[PDB]
Design a protein around this nucleic acid. Structure first.
Lengths: 237, 236
DNA sequence: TTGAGGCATTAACATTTGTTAACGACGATA
DNA sequence: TATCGTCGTTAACAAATGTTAATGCCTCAA
């Protein structure tokens, strides 16, 4: 839980905005029926995806509650882009706010205006950092960068390293995060990381045994976790 | 444009007057990180980062009017260690202390939404750019970056679309796409030259097949339509 | 006019990644 | 038990990109 997010929850429920329950594989919004929302993901795990005319899947970013995703601009109320927000956890809870009423809610209470503005600053800096590390070292650095992200957010200390508490993280789903189209390619990069004793693919889960190696290929992301998520970062250093 | 003028006159009421910078000058930097809210009013700049081993990265360009946050508003700490270099001859920007920003936005809520909107344009921009640069590797990354420059600094002419950037060397394009060696950028440009996509006149770039770049940057072209519809209409 | 340094082009090689396919392990259904 | 489907390896090949170096063009400075 988070303090600012819990007071925001009590603010929405006080104004008539009630929760909605989504189950795994469900889409809160999608790229084909654009509706300008403000998704306040309170509990659950989701991934922001995009599918091209070709049909290639792109895993842009994972979201873990509580956070704020918006599919439309605040002043114009027009689409910011055509993306899908798929629930990947077994169940998730979110507060769907029509883009228009949100304008009023934040106008009344500034404490929650700056909270939404803060998470937005977390998004901007996160995208620049992620874009920085994925671009420099090619696909190896992109797999290493993504595994660094998941290690901080879904990683727990274990005797065999640091286990990633994320189910159904197939080879395809890792490639989609780094723009790899073939599972055989992402698998090749994993084999190299196993031979270098960086990770161990024990029973359909990844165990990170050499965090410093990943920090080598994603310095701006580790820097971001330290500067933006100091609590999540400190629990592994 | 219009909403930035109201943010100018407003900033010209609370004693935060503009400062002038020249080319090669850094507004803020990564080694001495001061937290400011930059309101680039006029000029062109690039956001860069230098790794520990010296490699340069060009994250994106900024053309006024726009807003660049070097620090958070609640924690008042830094959002990351980046440099904002002026690449135009002259650029005017209003430097706002991060601790002052929170009190200034609470006064007028219409300018709060303005800074909020421009930040959403930043988020959407990064996702689209991240999307297109990842699918097709480096060829797509050069095409995407070229498509960006063609919309923002492009002007139609009898032959091609002139990308009006003084310094657009092969090394500077590679920094935008994560290519370390200029020879690799050239080889890719030689492929685009042979495929009738672009030509190279006076160390200046001309685009003749805009649709070809749209193939490799669908999300970025989608972004200009939704977020900068005026800049999009000039070429469609 | 001479000579230095930056930048683009091209080449030739090494490494990585795209692409397709065969093998084998595991789960599920009947 | 047998048999189909999915997913992970590993291979082999093609294509792209990393990397270095020689070359030619250009501006500058004396």
């Amino acid at each position: 839980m988070n303090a600012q997010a819990e007071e925001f929850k009590k603010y929405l429920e006080t104004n008539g905005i009630k929760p909605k329950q989504f189950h795994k594989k469900e889409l809160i919004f999608n790229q084909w029926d654009p509706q300008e929302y403000c998704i306040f993901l309170y509990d659950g795990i989701t991934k922001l995806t995009s599918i091209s005319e070709n049909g290639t899947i792109m895993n842009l970013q994972y979201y873990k509650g509580a956070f704020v995703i918006m599919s439309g601009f605040i002043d114009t109320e027009t689409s910011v882009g055509y993306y899908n927000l798929e629930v990947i956890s077994e169940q998730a809870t979110a507060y769907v706010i029509k883009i228009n009423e949100l304008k009023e809610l934040l106008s009344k209470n500034l404490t929650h205006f700056f909270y939404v503005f803060q998470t937005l600053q977390k998004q901007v800096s996160y995208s620049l950092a992620k874009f920085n590390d994925f671009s420099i070292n090619g696909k190896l650095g992109s797999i290493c960068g993504q595994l660094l992200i998941l290690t901080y957010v879904y990683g727990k200390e274990t005797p065999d390293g640091i286990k990633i508490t994320l189910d159904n993280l197939t080879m395809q789903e890792l490639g989609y995060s780094s723009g790899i189209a073939h599972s055989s390619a992402v698998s090749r990069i994993i084999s190299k990381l196993k031979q270098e004793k960086v990770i161990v693919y024990k029973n359909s889960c990844f165990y990170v045994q050499n965090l410093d190696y990943l920090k080598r290929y994603a310095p701006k992301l580790d820097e971001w976790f330290y500067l933006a998520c100091p609590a999540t970062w400190g629990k592994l250093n």
